[PDB]
Design an enzyme around this catalytic site. Structure first.
Site, PDB file in Angstrom:
ATOM      1  N   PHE B 142       0.860  -1.179   0.000  1.00 18.96           N
ATOM      2  CA  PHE B 142       0.000   0.000   0.000  1.00 18.96           C
ATOM      3  C   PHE B 142       0.895   1.227   0.000  1.00 18.96           C
ATOM      4  O   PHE B 142       1.683   1.417   0.932  1.00 18.96           O
ATOM      5  CB  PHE B 142      -0.940   0.053   1.214  1.00 18.96           C
ATOM      6  CG  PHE B 142      -1.856   1.247   1.174  1.00 18.96           C
ATOM      7  CD1 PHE B 142      -3.015   1.200   0.413  1.00 18.96           C
ATOM      8  CD2 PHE B 142      -1.522   2.428   1.817  1.00 18.96           C
ATOM      9  CE1 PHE B 142      -3.846   2.297   0.331  1.00 18.96           C
ATOM     10  CE2 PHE B 142      -2.362   3.525   1.733  1.00 18.96           C
ATOM     11  CZ  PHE B 142      -3.515   3.458   0.990  1.00 18.96           C
ATOM     12  N   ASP B 228       9.888   2.057   1.367  1.00 19.81           N
ATOM     13  CA  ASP B 228       8.769   2.900   1.775  1.00 19.81           C
ATOM     14  C   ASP B 228       8.691   2.814   3.287  1.00 19.81           C
ATOM     15  O   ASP B 228       8.204   1.819   3.837  1.00 19.81           O
ATOM     16  CB  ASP B 228       7.467   2.447   1.132  1.00 19.81           C
ATOM     17  CG  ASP B 228       6.299   3.377   1.475  1.00 19.81           C
ATOM     18  OD1 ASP B 228       6.452   4.215   2.394  1.00 19.81           O
ATOM     19  OD2 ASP B 228       5.237   3.290   0.828  1.00 19.81           O
ATOM     20  N   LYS B 257       3.803  10.761   7.102  1.00 31.44           N
ATOM     21  CA  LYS B 257       3.019  10.611   8.329  1.00 31.44           C
ATOM     22  C   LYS B 257       3.628  11.295   9.562  1.00 31.44           C
ATOM     23  O   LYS B 257       3.370  12.485   9.777  1.00 31.44           O
ATOM     24  CB  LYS B 257       2.752   9.124   8.582  1.00 31.44           C
ATOM     25  CG  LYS B 257       1.828   8.478   7.497  1.00 31.44           C
ATOM     26  CD  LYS B 257       1.129   7.239   8.049  1.00 31.44           C
ATOM     27  CE  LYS B 257      -0.091   6.760   7.250  1.00 31.44           C
ATOM     28  NZ  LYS B 257       0.025   5.455   6.539  1.00 31.44           N
TER      29      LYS B 257
HETATM   30  C1  LIG Z   1      -0.924   4.444   7.026  1.00 24.87           C
HETATM   31  O1  LIG Z   1       0.050   3.896   7.524  1.00 24.87           O
HETATM   32  C2  LIG Z   1      -1.994   3.569   6.373  1.00 24.87           C
HETATM   33  C3  LIG Z   1      -3.097   4.448   5.826  1.00 24.87           C
HETATM   34  C4  LIG Z   1      -2.837   5.167   4.766  1.00 24.87           C
HETATM   35  N1  LIG Z   1      -1.596   5.068   4.109  1.00 24.87           N
HETATM   36  C5  LIG Z   1      -3.959   6.078   4.357  1.00 24.87           C
HETATM   37  C6  LIG Z   1      -4.844   6.021   5.599  1.00 24.87           C
HETATM   38  C7  LIG Z   1      -6.284   6.117   5.201  1.00 24.87           C
HETATM   39  O2  LIG Z   1      -6.776   5.236   4.458  1.00 24.87           O
HETATM   40  O3  LIG Z   1      -6.927   7.098   5.623  1.00 24.87           O
HETATM   41  C8  LIG Z   1      -4.507   4.703   6.301  1.00 24.87           C
HETATM   42  C9  LIG Z   1      -2.398   2.366   7.250  1.00 24.87           C
HETATM   43  F1  LIG Z   1      -1.980   1.270   6.638  1.00 24.87           F
HETATM   44  F2  LIG Z   1      -3.700   2.224   7.425  1.00 24.87           F
HETATM   45  F3  LIG Z   1      -1.784   2.456   8.418  1.00 24.87           F
END
Ligand SMILES: *C(=O)[C@H](C1=C(N)C[C@@H](C(=O)O)C1)C(F)(F)F
Ligand SMILES: Cc1ncc(COP(=O)(O)O)c(C=O)c1O
Ligand SMILES: Cc1ncc(COP(=O)(O)O)c(C=O)c1O
Lengths: 404, 404
Positions: B142, B228, B257
């Site tokens: 992701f 990443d 983040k």
């Molecule tokens: C962040 O570490 C990660 C997420 C995103 N990247 C975007 C966030 C979202 O969908 O609002 C969540 C995770 F994997 F969920 F932690």
């Protein structure tokens, strides 16, 4: 002592990527229409951070909105609710008269969101077979630097060396209704994305009736009209939206830049339920999108535009600015164009005289502007400027131009 | 009076896009490890806004940096220099020991930047024929929600209905060195992009030696190793970078983040000159990238992680958390995994019992966590948590899990 301007230039050259070639000015303070460099010199800002500080630099109402919220809560993520987001959502949707908003951070993120909405609506509502949906764009367009955004660009500097490119993006000439009509004969087209004035291309204003004709064609062929107002929106051209000049209601409106008055990256995608709700929970998001700190400053940035009637000021003062720039000689400036306070002039560049030279001397005379091509200079001061401040700037411009 | 939680949910349902289904709790304040909802109830935050508030909510040092700079200058755009960016660029490049940094706003913008660098280096340095460059990704990856990012996803919720997709992305299994060796036989591969721990996929920790093997294979085949670290970096797993556990040096590192402590969208792309300088002035950028307000925040956010030794605390406290969670019966919790304070449990999901209901009850007992699948619950509190607070939280988790 503190660093000089040359200190600042060389530190960035050593430790920062070389993806920009900025005008040599090291700025340290901004307030309203003015910028100060580290040597203490004062400048008229005639770029407005590419129209991100329509409200002027560090507007007190927006600053206080940021300072009030930062001590309470700044980021929950969308995994939970916060108390601010829905207040902003109700405010901005009622202001622009759409059902819903999807919050994002940067302009290019808003454009990507719009492309995702157009495709999902194309497949789930229009009935296009997956994955044959097309999005049409206008030559000269600019909406950011992602791989998708450069895949719709006609500027080689944006896309060269960065392929292969996103499929399903078609390009037609700007300001060309017959070309649009031809493209929309294909039922696999889901959307047409277009700027009501092309800023990056040189403040290219399409002919009267263009937006009205785009709206008519998109509606006839069941195609979404995506209006990219990230630069033209929010009073810059003298209305809430540049499309308002022809009473045109796009299917999707993109906002960014001045949505925060320069204090926070906030962007927005506005549209009605039948489009917005094609995206289901879990199918699109952003870590910082819709966070309570950005929402508080966006509410205040929007309130500033409405309270201080900056659209009316931009319309009235833009008339003065264009009228005075048109007095310049036509062996020097070939054209004057723009709406509201989004304007540009085209200079008669020769082999030894260009727009970068003009902007260097404008900087020497206390006014900051950037050239968009070898022969075009954009003039876009903050919307909070007053007439006498404008006329003093027009003086600096006139004197700088003919001093060549 | 103020909106209730139900008021807040309903207002977002009416005026906001439905791209999220949040846990039904409505927060209005946060500080450190704690959040408060509008009814005044207090909760342990065991999500840390997806590891963006590693430093805790509203860390006073980061708040102070934001408040100090917001009075001075927030956005010049990259058409001019600001005095803050180079101080930040020098600070972060020396901290992570790379030549240069390219500043962006969101995590997906950093990943888009890395793909563009990889392609440009692939064509202009490695010598791949345009436009045949490939980037290899691991299944479960992701890195955001742009059209390009979802094109590499193996999660249908991310990509279904949003094509056609970006070409030139190949997918191999995670934690699979034979598969990487087979993929890198293609001389058109420019880069392998991989998370040292896959967070969104459910905190998938690869076997010891995986990252060393990745670095070895990438070097052997002249392929860029892009790490990443937008989620795993910045002390969350117990080190400055999760790749530090194997002491390997990626060619490109992505940060995001927690780079701002949750106060501002700031992201960064770190690499050496041979890669970074393939992008020439005018070929990449962003309106808000590198603005002085975000830079001041990021400097303070990084100083907090260093000054308070948060990596050491996450390492020490994470093993306690995992060891205590492993004491729960196997009929209920089937797996515990993580590094530092990035952890997850797998529950024995039945038709009547799933991760969502556990998290609803956790909320009822004063602790906020979110499921990442029907049977996975992430546990990731801010790194400023103390051992007694962690043990109090563990009691809540035990009582909740065993109450079913
Ligand atoms: C962040 O570490 C990660 C997420 C995103 N990247 C975007 C966030 C979202 O969908 O609002 C969540 C995770 F994997 F969920 F932690
Ligand atoms: C019309 C338009 N669309 C999109 C963008 C992208 O905004 P950003 O730089 O915040 O990604 C800009 C620049 C713009 O002027
Ligand atoms: C590992 C990883 N990379 C990239 C991103 C995208 O970050 P953002 O949501 O800021 O675009 C996320 C989320 C992430 O967890």
């Amino acid at each position: 002592g503190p660093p000089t301007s040359d200190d600042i230039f060389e530190r960035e050259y050593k430790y920062g990527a070389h993806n920009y070639h900025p005008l040599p000015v090291a700025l340290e303070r901004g307030k309203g229409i003015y910028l100060w460099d580290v040597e203490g010199r004062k400048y008229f800002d005639f770029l407005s951070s590419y129209s991100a500080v329509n409200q002027g630099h560090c507007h007190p109402k927006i600053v206080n909105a940021l300072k009030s919220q930062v001590d309470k809560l700044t980021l929950t993520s969308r995994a939970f609710y916060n108390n601010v987001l829905g207040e902003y959502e109700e405010y901005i949707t009622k202001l622009f008269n759409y059902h819903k908003v999807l919050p994002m951070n940067t302009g290019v993120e808003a454009g990507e969101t719009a492309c995702k909405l157009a495709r999902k609506w194309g497949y789930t509502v229009k009935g296009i077979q997956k994955y044959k949906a097309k999005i049409v764009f206008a030559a000269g367009n600019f909406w950011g630097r992602t791989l998708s955004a450069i895949s719709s660009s006609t500027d080689p500097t944006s896309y060269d060396g960065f392929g292969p490119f996103m499929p399903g993006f078609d390009i037609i000439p700007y300001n060309d209704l017959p070309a649009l009509e031809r493209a929309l004969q294909d039922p696999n087209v889901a959307a047409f994305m277009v700027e009501p004035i092309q800023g990056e291309a040189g403040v290219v204003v399409p002919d009267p009736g263009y937006l009205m004709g785009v709206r008519e064609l998109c509606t006839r062929h069941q195609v979404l009209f995506i209006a990219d107002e990230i630069q033209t929106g929010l009073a810059r051209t003298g209305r809430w939206l540049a499309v308002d000049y022809e009473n045109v209601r796009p299917d999707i409106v993109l906002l960014g830049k001045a949505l925060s008055g320069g204090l926070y990256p906030v962007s927005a995608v506005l549209c009605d339920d039948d489009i917005m709700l094609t995206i289901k929970p879990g199918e699109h998001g952003s870590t910082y999108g819709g966070n309570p700190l950005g929402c508080r400053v966006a509410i205040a940035a929007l309130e500033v535009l409405e309270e201080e009637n900056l659209a009316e000021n931009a319309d009235k003062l833009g008339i003065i600015l264009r009228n005075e720039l048109m007095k310049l000689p036509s062996d020097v400036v070939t054209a004057v164009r723009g709406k509201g306070l989004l304007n540009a002039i085209v200079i008669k560049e020769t082999k030894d005289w260009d727009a970068w030279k003009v902007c260097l001397r404008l900087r020497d005379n206390g006014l900051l502007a950037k050239p968009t091509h070898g022969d075009i200079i954009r003039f876009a001061p903050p919307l909070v400027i007053k007439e006498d401040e404008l006329r003093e700037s027009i003086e600096i411009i006139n004197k700088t131009i003919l001093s060549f």
